[PDB]
Amino acid sequence: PRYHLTRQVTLTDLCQPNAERAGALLLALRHPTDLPHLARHRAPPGRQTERLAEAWGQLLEASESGCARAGLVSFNFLVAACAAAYDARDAAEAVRAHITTNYAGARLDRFSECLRAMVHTHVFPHEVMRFFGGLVSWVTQDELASVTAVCSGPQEATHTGHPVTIPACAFVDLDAELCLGGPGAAFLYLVFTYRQCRDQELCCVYVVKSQLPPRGLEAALERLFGRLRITTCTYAAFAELGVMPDDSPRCLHRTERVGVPVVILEGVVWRPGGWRACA
Amino acid sequence: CFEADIAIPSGISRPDAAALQRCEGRVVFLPTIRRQLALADVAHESFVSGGVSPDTLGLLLAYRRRFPAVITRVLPTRIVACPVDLGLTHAGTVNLRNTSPVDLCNGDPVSLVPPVFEGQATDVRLESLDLTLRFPVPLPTPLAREIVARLVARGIRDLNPRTPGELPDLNVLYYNGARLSLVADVQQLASVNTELRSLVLNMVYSITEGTTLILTLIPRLLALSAQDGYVNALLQMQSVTREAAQAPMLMQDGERRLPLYEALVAWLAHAGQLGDILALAPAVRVCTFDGAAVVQSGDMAPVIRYP
Amino acid sequence: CFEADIAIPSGISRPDAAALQRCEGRVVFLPTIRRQLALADVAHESFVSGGVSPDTLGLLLAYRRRFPAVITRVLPTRIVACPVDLGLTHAGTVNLRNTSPVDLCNGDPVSLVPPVFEGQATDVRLESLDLTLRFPVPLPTPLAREIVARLVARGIRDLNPDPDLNVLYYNGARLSLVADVQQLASVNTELRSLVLNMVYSITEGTTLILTLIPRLLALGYVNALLQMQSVTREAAQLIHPEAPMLMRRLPLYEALVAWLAHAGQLGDILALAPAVRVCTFDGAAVVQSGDMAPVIRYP
Amino acid sequence: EVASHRRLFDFFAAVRSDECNTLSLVRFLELGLSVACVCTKFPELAYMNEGRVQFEV
Amino acid sequence: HQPLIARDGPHPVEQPVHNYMTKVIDRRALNAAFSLATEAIALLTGEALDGTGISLHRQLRAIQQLARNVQAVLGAFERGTADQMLHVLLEKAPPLAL
């Protein structure tokens, strides 16, 4: 009812929202203790399915689940772990200087191996680490966590807009699509662009910028790419991060919390959307 | 609603102000999200591209990259439109006008189709503001998916001639009775070609490795034909399935991948999505509060969200 | 919200009254949205479409057709349900009853057929007025799309016989799909019509495309770009399938619409779109079978 | 007119109302010449569409 | 308390069953509703007024909208009262040829 609260109790083995900002684009970790099984399934047999059986098992080594399940993944944890992967180096790598000095690359180094191992056996990182929200409160303990980081529509950026102002956490991120500029409202999405066996199972996390519908986004997902050179398949999944109902309030900064480039985005209808991955 | 207005820009033909009154509940394709916008991008002259007007398959592609909007209230100064793509958050269920020869149902998903009918052109003309208006025809979605397959395949017959001139017209439609004839006047090629390619390229990926085992059971299909009712009615007479009847190819690597289960996945990925990648997305659903089971031609039906 | 009332009919027993006490928080389907309704619009006997009992196809036609309603508070002489499909997005928190998987903190659960699980579980019958309330199963979007394609794949090996498809691990648990002793023999006769639908839409199109594309490209931007992204994929499928199978334009393009007409049916039939969301507050983020969950309105 | 005018303006927000040192004070008003340069006034425009004044010389 | 015509002869004795039979009350809805526009919400409460009589005059034309509507729904029950009696008589009416 244009104001909501959500809560999930996890560890600070992940994000450590005390080390994060007030505004962070948190993911969950849905199906957290999953993927020894789907490592074996869903892949053609030339992928040697005994890789992710150890790969996530080295992740929680860096992080026993207990009663506080592994979850609440930060926005930082994918950018810096793919910083060595995608086509931005020493600028996306400034996100690694943000994490390891505030959060830890010990958990990144196990997970950057997962980002070459999850995508290896066709266990693609979309529909795992589902969207949760914008880190409203951080009522966490010392080594444990209790975060309210509301999902559920536009109210996350009104109740942090009548007061976290939604950073993009990298100037390389918030992909400035539509340089063909005009007035309107912004429509935000979460795309994982892949490269399968060309760049050896590439991982990518960035947000697009468009005044485009979901039907005007799929052909926009076929155009503007140079990573078509694959053949397996089902690359470039995306869901709706929702509407920023203003293109006027975007910004360009390098000040956060290590000087990391960052984009202020004030006022967002967080339509949670749905994923799609077929081609 | 997240209110969006379109003003009356310049002058009025005095009966044509009443023509804007009887368009309450229709749909405007405005290619933006504005707090105010001129009426110039509204009409079909904006639908016309550089030099050339779209065909009824190009208008599908023209209605692709624009935004539908519902006429809510009609002022002599403005027209308040509600942005369907975002502002469908209406427990008041903002109302639409059915301009269609089909009496629908209760509970139909409703998708929008350009005017292609033989007698429901929806042509209203403004001469003070020199503009032409084609309103889309809201229709039920299986009947909508029965139309778009006809018009592309009619343009598939625009590539190759070969056959004698007596072709099956693709111009007789069937809803419980109700013989419908549509318009076949012009078929622009690029609207056919780009629609044909995605019909090709999606049907490429919808075949996989474990898909091939299913092809063995094609003679198994006709074994059910002469021994039941359901199968024999399922098997169409104008089908290639009755024509193709007149094998593992071992290559077995590993055999723990579930090859038959993986076949139905990627087939559904692309051949399962063939109505919506060719046509417009349905977001309008029939929902009347009074318990009325159908909605008459010309009525004001209440409209709820995405199906 | 806009709470809608379903009228309790005449004389029921106390176990029929207690049957109404074991359903507080289930999912109910209804044809129209009249503010007063009766129980005659609710029962499984109200799902007859051709004079016989519906199958899992005949339910999933209606399960995508009519409207979900969730009973908040049970009553004598009435049934209060605050329906899902009315109201603005992410408002009007409602409460569900879990069935054997988790329903995690997210997942966007989907109503679907009973006989994909135990058939005479959740087929709760009223004894006095003699009607049957077969409540749908609320499964979340990944596993709901998973199990729907497995039994119809298991229907193939049950169709014309000569691995085992039924293990299907969850994140933690091992989900026993097979309820062997009396259900699986009823499975392959209650998904009976449905397997023919997944087959005939494959046998038609693949045997149509292999006489479409050779009839195309020479009858040119779509020509060379046909196998451009399909190099050694479609020509390899032309090498594999067209050899170990058999090989007309005016019936062909007549069959073009008809298959793709059946294709547009199945997309509305299959894939089980999300209707309601779990995104709770101050919970343990993990729901168990038989426990309530705060469930919010729109995906 | 004038006193009848704002008397409902105060009431409109009134029914919408249910819906270590001092010198923190400055004062202000502006009238008198605020009518002189204006050099005519019709108050109370109602729901109106067109205003015609015709000249005969 | 049904009568007895208690008999002569050795046919056995009559027996007064002064039984209590019960019945069952039904439950009915009888629902009615009426609209109210997007304006006249600030009006009829006291939000959108002014010192203009026009503000008072269109405040009149909401009152003369409700004053016809309140009698319409309060009428609709008395109209609806008779319509139930035509249902509950015809529900217990057998056809008189039988």
Q: Which of E51, E54, E58 sits opposite D4 (nearest CB)?
A: E51
Q: Measuring CA to CA, which residue among C298, A33, C58, C201 is closest to residue B304?
A: C298
Q: What is the dihedral of CA B160, B163, B169, B175, to 10 degrees?
A: -100
For residue C137, what is the enclosing H or E element? strand C137-139
Q: Distance from A226 to chain C by nearest Cα, in Å?
A: 14
Residue C88 to residue D31: CA distance in whole angstroms: 49
CB of B254 within 8 Å of a chain A CB? The answer is yes
Burial degree of C184 (CB within 10 A; 0-12, 13-18, 19+): middle
Sheet holding C36-38, edge to edge: C27-30, C67-74, C79-83, C4-7, C36-38
Residues of D in contact with E39 (CB under 8 A): none
Residue C145 to residue C153: CA distance in whole angstroms: 13
DSSP character at residue B224: G
Q: What is the DSSP string of B168-223?
A: --S--B-SSS--B-B------HHHHHHHHHHHHHHHHHT--SGGGGGGGGHHHHGG
Residue A261 to residue A263: CA distance in whole angstroms: 7
Q: What is the dihedral of CA C44, C48, C49, C51, to 10 degrees?
A: 160
Residues of B in contact with C88 (CB under 8 A): 89-91
Q: Measuring CA to CA, which residue among B72, B83, B76, B95 is closest to residue B29?
A: B83
Residue C66 contacts residue C105 (beta carbons within 8 Å): no
Describe the crossing of helices A94-102 and A105-117 by its angle, rounded to 10 degrees.
130
Amino acid in position A74? S
Residue C40 to residue C45: CA distance in whole angstroms: 8
Residue C214 to residue C247: CA distance in whole angstroms: 11
Cα(first)–Cα(last) distance of chain B, in Å? 19
Resolution number, Å: 5.4
10 Å Cβ neighbour count for B102?
19
φ, ψ of residue E58 in degrees (nearest 5):
-80, -15
Distances (CA, A) of C18 to C15, C290, E25: 4, 17, 21
Residue A205 contacts residue A129 (beta carbons within 8 Å): no
Residue B155 to residue B153: CA distance in whole angstroms: 5
Amino acid in position C268? D
Q: What is the DSSP string of C10-35?
A: S---HHHHHHTTS-TT-EEEES---S
Describe the crossing of helices B259-270 and B189-205 by its angle, rounded to 10 degrees.
170
Residue B109 to residue B304: CA distance in whole angstroms: 10
Residue C100 to residue A246: CA distance in whole angstroms: 44
Helices marked H in C53-136 = 56-63
Strand duo A186-192 + C294-296: pairing: unpaired
φ, ψ of residue B240 in degrees (nearest 5):
-85, -10
Residue B40 to residue B126: CA distance in whole angstroms: 12
SS3 A36: coil
Q: Measuring CA to CA, which residue among A86, A90, A71 is closest to residue A236?
A: A86
Where b means 16+ CB within 10 Å and e means fewer, C229-262 reads bbeebbeebbebbeeebeeebeebbbbbbbbbbb
Residue to test with chain A: of B1, B2, B33, most A Cβ within 10 A: B33
Q: Distance from A45 to chain B by nearest Cα, in Å?
A: 6
Q: Measuring CA to CA, which residue among C285, C23, C18, C4 is closest to residue C127?
A: C18
Residue B98 contacts residue B138 (beta carbons within 8 Å): yes
- Alpha carbon A60 to its chain centroid, in Å, reads 19
Q: Are A213 and B85 inside 8 Å of each other by CB? A: yes
Neighbouring-strand partners of residue A244: A186
Q: Which of B34, B257, B270 sits opposite A278 (nearest CB)?
A: B270
Strand duo C131-134 + B131-134: pairing: unpaired
Where b means 16+ CB within 10 Å and e means fewer, E80-96 reads eeeeeeeeeeeeeeeee
Residue A3 contacts residue A114 (beta carbons within 8 Å): no
10 Å Cβ neighbour count for B257?
20
DSSP character at residue B282: P
Q: Show the tokens assigned to A22.
A: 């007030």
Cα(first)–Cα(last) distance of chain A, in Å? 37
Residue to test with chain E: of D9, D12, D19, most E Cβ within 10 A: D12
φ, ψ of residue B270 in degrees (nearest 5):
-125, -45
Residue C78 to residue C55: CA distance in whole angstroms: 30
Residue A49 contacts residue A122 (beta carbons within 8 Å): no
Tally the residues of chain D: 57
Q: Are E29 and C11 inside 8 Å of each other by CB? A: no
In the structure, do chain A and chain D come into contact, i.e. share 3 or more CB pairs under 8 Å? no
In the structure, do chain D and chain C come into contact, i.e. share 3 or more CB pairs under 8 Å? no
Residue A200 to residue A227: CA distance in whole angstroms: 12
DSSP character at residue B280: P
Q: Show the tokens assigned to B259.
A: 């090859």
Q: Measuring CA to CA, which residue among B77, B72, B75, B46 is closest to residue B59?
A: B46
Beta-carbon contacts of A19 under 8 Å, excluding residues fewer than 6 positions away, are A102, A103
Q: Show the tokens assigned to E45.
A: 């409460």
Where b means 16+ CB within 10 Å and e means fewer, A147-179 reads bbbbbbbbbbbbbbbeebbbbbbbbbbbbebbe
Strand duo C4-7 + B123-126: pairing: unpaired
Q: What is the DSSP string of A175-242?
A: B----S--SS-EEEEEEE---SSSSSS----EEB-BS--TTTTHHHHHSS-S----------EEEEEE
Q: Measuring CA to CA, which residue among C258, C236, C134, A138 is closest to residue B207?
A: C236
- Alpha carbon C21 to its chain centroid, in Å, reads 26
Burial degree of A33 (CB within 10 A; 0-12, 13-18, 19+): middle
Q: What is the DSSP string of chain D?
A: --HHHHHHHHHHHHHSS--------------STTTTTT--------S-S--------
SS3 A11: strand
CB pairs under 8 A between A and B: 57
Residue A195 to residue A233: CA distance in whole angstroms: 9
Q: Which of C90, C170, C283 sits opposite A152 (nearest CB)?
A: C90
Q: Distance from C77 to chain E by nearest Cα, in Å?
A: 7
Q: Which of C274, C285, C296 sits opposite A152 (nearest CB)?
A: C296
For residue B265, what is the enclosing H or E element? helix B259-270
Residue C136 contacts residue C27 (beta carbons within 8 Å): yes
Residue B254 to residue B188: CA distance in whole angstroms: 50
Distances (CA, A) of C106 to A14, C142, C278, C283: 18, 11, 5, 12
Describe the crossing of helices A105-117 and A52-62 by its angle, rounded to 10 degrees.
170
10 Å Cβ neighbour count for A231?
14
Q: Show the tokens assigned to C98.
A: 């879990």
Residue A69 contacts residue A78 (beta carbons within 8 Å): no
Distances (CA, A) of C180 to B44, B227, B260: 62, 29, 22
Q: Measuring CA to CA, which residue among A176, A44, A58 is closest to residue A117?
A: A58
Residue A263 to residue A266: CA distance in whole angstroms: 10
Distances (CA, A) of C199 to B212, B216, B261, C25, C203: 12, 11, 13, 37, 6
Residue A48 contacts residue A111 (beta carbons within 8 Å): no
Against chain B, the chains showing at least 3 CB pairs within 8 Å are A, C
Residue A106 to residue C108: CA distance in whole angstroms: 33
Strand duo B303-304 + B284-286: pairing: antiparallel
Residue C172 to residue A25: CA distance in whole angstroms: 27
Amino acid in position A187? F
Distances (CA, A) of B242 to A166, C202, C250: 60, 14, 15
- Alpha carbon A205 to its chain centroid, in Å, reads 6
Amino acid in position A135? L
Residue C204 to residue B239: CA distance in whole angstroms: 7
Beta-carbon contacts of C267 under 8 Å, excluding residues fewer than 6 positions away, are B272, B273, B274, B275, B276
Amino acid in position B8? I
Structural method: cryo-EM
Describe the crossing of helices B141-156 and C249-269 by its angle, rounded to 10 degrees.
150
Describe the crossing of helices C192-209 and C249-269 by its angle, rounded to 10 degrees.
140
Residue to test with chain C: of E24, E25, E26, E27, most C Cβ within 10 A: E27
Residue to test with chain C: of A9, A31, A65, A156, most C Cβ within 10 A: A31
Q: Are E47 and D9 inside 8 Å of each other by CB? A: no
Residue B275 to residue A72: CA distance in whole angstroms: 37
Q: Are A33 and C274 inside 8 Å of each other by CB? A: no
SS3 A92: coil
Q: Are B65 and A216 inside 8 Å of each other by CB? A: yes
Residues of E in contact with D1 (CB under 8 A): 51
Residue B292 contacts residue B279 (beta carbons within 8 Å): no
Residue C277 to residue C297: CA distance in whole angstroms: 6
